[PDB]
Ligand binder design. Structure first.
Ligand SMILES: CCCCCCCCCCCCCCCCCC(=O)OC[C@H](COP(=O)([O-])OCC[N+](C)(C)C)OC(=O)CCCCCCCCCCCCCCCCC
Ligand SMILES: CCCCCCCCCCCCCCCCCC(=O)OC[C@H](COP(=O)([O-])OCC[N+](C)(C)C)OC(=O)CCCCCCCCCCCCCCCCC
Ligand SMILES: CCCCCCCCCCCCCCCCCC(=O)OC[C@H](COP(=O)([O-])OCC[N+](C)(C)C)OC(=O)CCCCCCCCCCCCCCCCC
Ligand SMILES: CCCCCCCCCCCCCCCCCC(=O)OC[C@H](COP(=O)(O)OCCN)OC(=O)CCCCCCCCCCCCCCCCC
Ligand SMILES: CCCCCCCCCCCCCCCCCC(=O)OC[C@H](COP(=O)(O)OCCN)OC(=O)CCCCCCCCCCCCCCCCC
Ligand SMILES: CS(=O)(=O)C1CCN(c2cccc(Cn3cc(-c4nc(-c5ccc(OC(F)(F)F)cc5)no4)ccc3=O)c2)CC1
Ligand code: SF4
Ligand code: SF4
Ligand code: SF4
Lengths: 178, 115, 47, 156, 318
């Protein structure tokens, strides 16, 4: 179906009352007074402004911000160098080099992420079959230097050791929806 | 004398502000900074070329209307006169002729801009 | 206890009815009123 | 009444001014400009901090590179920056501006705005949450808090 | 003593310009569902000083294409005139009693346009020239109706002096007999200041900044403060002419108080209007002032020429 927005106008019938009403509208600026009234109403409303950085904007567990490599509760690393994360990373931001750890386990030596290439898409944490790489909630990690934004294994491991209390709970919340 | 005083005080205030604006801050001048601004790219020409005017007739008319205003301004005094009928008639004739000229311009499409 | 399928499904009976049409209301005086007020003000001021 | 103490306080004042009044420039290239807007919106009121978008570079103090920087646009960006008057700061917003981002290996993208202009602060994200861009603005405020220019002049 | 009076008339006007920028920002914010400056100081009473200090600490620009003489003169003149228009104002007693005070106002205002013209021409940039030509059009549009409105009002005052309006309104505002003229004068003062909806001289959406686009911190601050001072000036003019504060010779302080209240109301209305409306096209401004305001203005000029005669209400010459 369809409707008209500016064809409503029908044949012209005009009286003295209609003419006088249009004249008052044209001479006393009726329609503009109404915009003035709207802006006035907004002045006496509560502003939606939050007091950052004290009170902050809402978020959800699914928020995908800063990356971190997690561990099993034993302290062992979850990554096994399967390389799905870098195989799908559509920005080619991940870089991995694996090697048999002295104990024989399959682990990484290099795990680098150019956070100037990451598009923060989440494909790596939905590809990881061991829930090792995640995209944490932290977004307040700006820097004064480009180099600081080229994370390696130690940086991501430290982030994981810093946010686990939050990452784990957000996972526990969201992992049934996946 | 007091008007001179006040106006010169204002001149001096403005000039002091400009002096301390041009000599206080640290500068670093180079051509790419001192060059004209045309939205990120280089001008294709100079801004000193004929910029056509489409309301030239309206400006010309504004001159004559300013003069008619100059002739209307002495009314506050012309109303203190004994010959009141003459002042009334002359003011009415003046304003009416002004309005008639404006109406002729309007109709002949002078107040509309060349396109 | 047990576990049925749980899903963000609408509530029984559906959600309330939503307003989507224009409601720019109608207000103001009658026009004659405005002009009468203005003319009376002019006349009182002149007097 | 040590001149060094007086100079430190004067520099505090200078930086307070240049900091509590940061007028950026209406320079938005790609998606990240939307989060710039949203940071201008009620929830995050910029003017609340003294921030005001002026459209002329000759009046601005900082420029937020809010999106991807192509090779056809880099000359204009460098020109605008050059036309901004010192003191002038720069903020790279997003991953396109920092290192090309999702278009890093393209033939028509500069792999970082830091190649064309010098950058004070890098805001990561695709796009950065307006809250994050505000965090970056305040990080810049603090960096300005730590300029110590007149102390250097007095030590020279 | 006169220099102290100069100070007591000048420094408060500049402080009021600053806090007017403040009130502008905060009012527009609350209308836009936001706060406005509250960080820099208690509720933001230091943002104007921050802005001004920061500007007068910045590198100004001496471009290569500019006529530096006019480029530097124009802001000087703008600020000078913005501050000089405040001297003949009775609040209720003026610093300079002029018989032709209205004409002083008119001429100084019509002169403040040459700051914009010469700035935009000197800058030697296309957007600057566009802002200058738009100012030309705006003046050509409003200046015709300004003087005729003002004459039609004064034909019941009896003189061009600003201090006889006080005795004229001693019993009743001049808004009742002249509210049409008051409306037209309000919009024309709205245009005289290049203020929304008539912010065409610096229209950011068409001309990045207009005549300011090449100007930098200090001179730009001069331009800006001149604008925000002329705002208050024209509000004071409206509220001395059409609105009448209470004049009791033993109580001029009440006169100043009510004058200030009304001026604040009119200025807040200017800000309200900036927040509430889009921007004109600078041909439509001409069409308005020359097709709806000028005919009616002439008709009302004739009406107020006749009214003192068929009413025997001709005013006195002192
Ligand atoms: C501070 C509180 C003041 C609030 C002012 C803002 C307006 C409030 C909202 C009102 C609104 O919604 O619109 C109402 C209405 C909207 O009406 P409407 O558009 O819904 O329909 C009107 C119907 N007709 C066309 C017949 C009139 O607008 C008005 O009533 C305006 C009244 C005229 C205003 C005159 C302004 C000139 C003042 C100087 C002259 C003084 C003499 C008075 C002569 C008359
Ligand atoms: C009504 C308008 C009111 C607003 C105007 C009020 C403004 C008043 C501000 C008073 C503060 C005075 C100090 C401001 C100096 C800032 C200039 C500056 O940053 O240059 C640094 C300069 C830098 O010195 P420098 O020697 O280190 O520079 C070396 C060369 N460069 C910069 C290229 C590396 O410091 C000074 O020389 C200024 C000394 C302070 C005293 C000046 C008088
Ligand atoms: C009354 C008008 C005066 C009529 C007599 C002329 C006296 C001045 C002539 C001297 C040359 C000035 C000139 O034209 O230079 C071009 C300049 C244009 O800039 P510019 O082209 O000289 O730029 C030169 C750049 N530098 C400074 C680096 C060399 O304009 C002027 O200087 C004169 C503008 C006229 C202003 C007259 C009012 C003076 C107000 C009192 C101060
Ligand atoms: C016996 C009596 C003898 C005395 C004789 C007098 C009798 C009374 C006559 C009353 C006449 C009414 C008053 C005249 C003023 C209004 C003039 C006018 O109507 O202009 C209308 C003009 C055109 O509007 P438009 O819809 O485009 O129509 C175009 C034509 N086809 O559009 C406009 O001009 C208005 C648009 C301007 C928009 C700018 C923003 C306006 C802001 C509104 C603020 C309102 C607050 C007023 C505060 C006043 C306090 C001083
Ligand atoms: C220098 C470059 C910059 C130039 C720009 C300076 C700013 C210009 C401001 C605009 C002035 C234009 C209008 C002309 C001045 C106003 C004339 C005036 O108001 O009257 C002069 C005054 C007497 O006037 P009046 O009251 O009518 O006479 C009866 C008094 N018992 O008493 C007088 O006779 C005093 C006349 C002096 C007028 C002041 C001019 C100062 C110029 C400084 C330069
Ligand atoms: C989206 S919006 O609707 O929100 C939009 C509405 C408009 N808006 C707005 C309104 C008013 C001012 C500003 C900040 N601003 C300030 C200046 C400027 N100010 C002074 C100055 C000098 C002396 C002063 O007094 C003393 F210092 F004591 F002498 C005080 C001040 N010089 O330059 C110049 C340009 C500028 O943008 C911004 C916010 C945004
Ligand atoms: S979120 Fe996407 S772009 Fe970022 S590292 Fe993971 S897979 Fe790569
Ligand atoms: S997908 Fe997970 S386990 Fe596989 S290489 Fe990447 S981080 Fe390691
Ligand atoms: S970083 Fe992401 S959001 Fe920002 S401009 Fe590039 S693609 Fe768009």
């Amino acid at each position: 179906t369809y409707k008209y927005v500016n064809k409503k106008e029908q044949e012209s019938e005009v009286d003295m009352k209609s003419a006088t009403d249009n004249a008052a509208r044209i001479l006393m600026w009726t329609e503009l007074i109404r915009g003035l009234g709207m802006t006035l109403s907004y002045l006496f409303r509560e502003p939606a402004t939050i007091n950052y950085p004290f009170e902050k904007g809402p978020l959800s567990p699914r928020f995908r911000g800063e990356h971190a490599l997690r561990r099993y509760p034993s302290g062992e690393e979850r990554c096994i160098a399967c390389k799905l994360c870098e195989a799908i990373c559509p920005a080619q931001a991940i870089t991995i080099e694996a090697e048999p750890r002295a104990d024989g386990s399959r682990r990484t030596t290099r795990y680098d992420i150019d956070m100037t290439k990451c598009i923060y898409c989440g494909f790596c944490q939905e590809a990881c079959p061991v829930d090792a790489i995640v995209e944490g909630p932290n977004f307040e990690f700006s820097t004064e230097t480009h180099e600081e934004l080229l994370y390696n294994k130690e940086k991501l491991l430290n982030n994981g050791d810093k946010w686990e209390a939050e990452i784990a709970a957000n996972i526990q919340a969201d992992y049934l929806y996946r | 004398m007091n008007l001179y005083t006040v106006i010169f005080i204002n001149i001096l205030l403005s000039l002091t502000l400009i002096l301390v604006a041009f000599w206080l801050p640290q500068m670093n001048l180079y051509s790419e900074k001192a060059n004209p601004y045309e939205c990120g790219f280089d001008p294709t020409s100079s801004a000193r070329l004929p910029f056509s005017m489409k309301f030239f007739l309206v400006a010309i008319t504004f001159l004559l209307f300013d003069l008619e205003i100059a002739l209307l301004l002495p009314l506050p005094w012309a109303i203190q006169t004994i010959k009141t009928s003459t002042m009334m008639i002359m003011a009415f004739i003046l304003v009416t002729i002004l309005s008639l000229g404006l109406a002729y311009e309007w109709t002949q499409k002078g107040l509309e801009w060349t396109e | 206890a047990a576990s049925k399928v749980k899903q963000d499904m609408p509530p029984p009976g559906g959600y309330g009815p939503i307003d989507y049409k224009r409601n720019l209301p109608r207000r103001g005086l009658s026009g004659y009123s405005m002009f009468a007020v203005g003319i009376g003000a002019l006349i009182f001021g002149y007097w | 009444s040590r001149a060094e103490y007086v100079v430190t306080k004067l520099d505090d004042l200078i930086n307070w001014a240049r900091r509590s009044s940061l007028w950026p420039m209406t320079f938005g290239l790609a998606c990240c400009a939307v989060e710039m807007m949203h940071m201008a919106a009620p929830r995050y009121d910029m003017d609340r901090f003294g921030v005001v978008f002026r459209a002329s570079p000759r009046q601005a103090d900082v420029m937020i590179v809010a999106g991807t920087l192509t090779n056809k646009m880099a000359p204009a960006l460098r020109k605008v920056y050059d036309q901004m008057p010192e003191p002038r700061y720069v903020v790279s917003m997003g991953s396109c501006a920092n290192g090309g981002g999702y278009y890093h290996y393209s033939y028509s993208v500069v792999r970082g705005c830091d190649r064309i202009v010098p950058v004070d602060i890098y805001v990561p994200g695709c796009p950065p949450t307006a809250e994050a861009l505000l965090y970056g603005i305040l990080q810049l405020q603090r960096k300005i808090k730590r300029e110590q220019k007149l102390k250097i002049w007095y030590r020279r | 003593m006169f220099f102290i009076n100069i100070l007591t008339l000048l420094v408060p006007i500049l402080i009021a310009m600053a806090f007017l920028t403040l009130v502008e920002r905060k009012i527009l914010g609350y209308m836009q569902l936001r706060k406005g400056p509250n960080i820099v100081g208690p509720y933001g009473i230091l943002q104007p000083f921050a802005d001004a200090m920061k500007l007068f600490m910045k590198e100004p620009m001496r471009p290569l294409t500019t006529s530096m003489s006019l480029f530097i003169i124009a802001p000087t003149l703008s600020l000078t005139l913005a501050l000089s228009l405040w001297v003949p104002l009775p609040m209720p007693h003026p610093l300079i009693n002029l018989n032709l005070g209205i004409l002083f106002i008119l001429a100084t205002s019509s002169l403040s346009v040459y700051s914009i013209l010469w700035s935009g021409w000197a800058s030697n940039s296309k957007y600057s020239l566009f802002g200058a030509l738009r100012a030309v059009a705006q003046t050509i549009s409003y200046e015709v109706t300004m003087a005729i409105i003002l004459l039609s009002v004064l034909l019941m005052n009896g003189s061009y002096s600003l201090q006889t309006l006080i005795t004229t309104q001693e019993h009743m505002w001049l808004l009742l007999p002249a509210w049409p003229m008051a409306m037209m004068w309000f919009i024309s003062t709205l245009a005289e200041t290049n203020r929304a909806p008539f912010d065409l001289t610096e229209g950011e959406s068409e001309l990045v900044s207009g005549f300011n686009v090449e100007y930098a911190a200090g001179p730009f601050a001069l331009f800006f403060m001149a604008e925000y001072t002329n705002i208050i000036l024209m509000n004071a003019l409206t509220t001395i002419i059409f609105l009448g504060p209470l004049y009791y010779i033993n109580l001029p302080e009440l006169y100043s108080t009510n004058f200030m209240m009304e001026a604040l109301l009119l200025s807040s209305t200017f800000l309200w209007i900036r927040a509430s409306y889009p921007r004109f096209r600078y041909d439509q401004l001409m069409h308005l002032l020359w097709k709806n305001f000028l005919p009616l203005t002439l008709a009302l000029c004739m009406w107020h020429i006749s009214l003192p005669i068929f009413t025997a209400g001709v005013p006195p010459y002192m």
